[model samples]
Target: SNRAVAVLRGETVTGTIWITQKSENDQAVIEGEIKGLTPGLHGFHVHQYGDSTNGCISAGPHFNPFGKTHGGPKSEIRHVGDLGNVEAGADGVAKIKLTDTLVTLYGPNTVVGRSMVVHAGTGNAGARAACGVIALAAPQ
Candidate 1:
């Protein structure tokens, strides 16, 4: 069978990422089972572009399918890529999952050739705290 792979890279507070195509309706879904994350609310979103050289700043603004300005993930006034926040447990672990409908793995808007990032800070609802890129997975 032809299976698509998801690639991810990050550091103590920053890194790179990737995902592959598996089906025609295959979207890039990321499941972050992170430990040692600060408890409480944390921001999440898909930036407008990709960049591995400049931390989260390189990723740019949230991916706004509606052509709107930046806003909270859950805000009705937010970008299409704004996924809002992930709540961390008291144990300092944040188990979060997000899917990018605009990030197609097999279509014209495929995100396979680009990168996805994770930040250290809460996106401040503004600035980037940490960062990572997304990439395609390799066959084992």
Candidate 2:
């Protein structure tokens, strides 16, 4: 199976997430440990562009190539980027892992040319606290 990795960073925060495909399944195993987040849930998504030239906003909206609304990864009417939330601990860290069937690394639905943005909310929502460009990675 192939894999991908995102080097996550906020305007001031930093982390990384590993994306791997299960050879026998249709899901991506996403997991990572992030620091400097608020002690709560944060909105995590795959944005439309790999451009973080102007920070996270440059990445554009969610990677909704199919055109949909914001919702969880498994929601039938959600965007391909709608990964729902990542919860932080009292330590200001958000470490998460899950099987996301909506995302892939080797298909038309791949996020290779995109970016991952971590927002400051479980809000309401805002621009972006951090973001990372998604790129294919060698198996390790």
Candidate 3:
């Protein structure tokens, strides 16, 4: 099983996400933790490019390789990167452990080399809080 990881870095979102092939059907389990987040729900999703030179501002739009509008990961027509939100506690900490059905570690839909961002607001999912590049990781 192929696996990968994205280390999110921001003034607030600082943590790591474990990306692994969860099923033979293009599914993956996104497991990780991010600290220093605002208390409450925050917008989260994968981005089109891995460029974070501007700390997510340069990550471009969502990874909409399928040419879709903004939607949750479970949407019938959504970006492969639209993995959805991460909730932070009153202590400014967010823990993530979700099984995503639209992302992969290989092939055209591969999330590697792309970007992941934790936005400040919701609804449209924008405003950079944390951003990271998805990359291949050492097998565990």
Which candidate has the highest TM-score of all? 2
- By TM-score, the better pick of 2 and 3 is 2
lDDT of 1: 0.51
lDDT score for candidate 3 against the true structure: 0.77
Off by over 4 Å in 3: 22-26, 70-76, 122-126
By how many angstroms RMSD does model 2 differ from the true structure?
Answer: 4.1
Name the lDDT value of residue 130 in candidate 3: 82
lDDT of 2 by residue, 1-140 (tens): 37888998775667798888855346778888777776677888888898977777688877887776346654466467878888877777777787754787876777886988888763222658888998888975
RMSD of 3: 4.2
* Reference-based TM-score, model 1: 0.62
Model 2: residues with Cα > 4 Å off, grouped in runs: 23-25, 69-76, 122-125
Count clashing residue pairs in model 1.
18
TM values, all candidates: 0.62, 0.83, 0.82
- Model 3 Cα lDDT, one tens digit per residue, 1-112: 4788888888756889888884456567888888877677777788888986666778898777787644566455656676777787666667788874577776677788
The superposed Cα distance between candidate 1 and the true structure at residue 90, in angstroms, equals 2.9
- Tell me, by lDDT, which candidate is best: 2
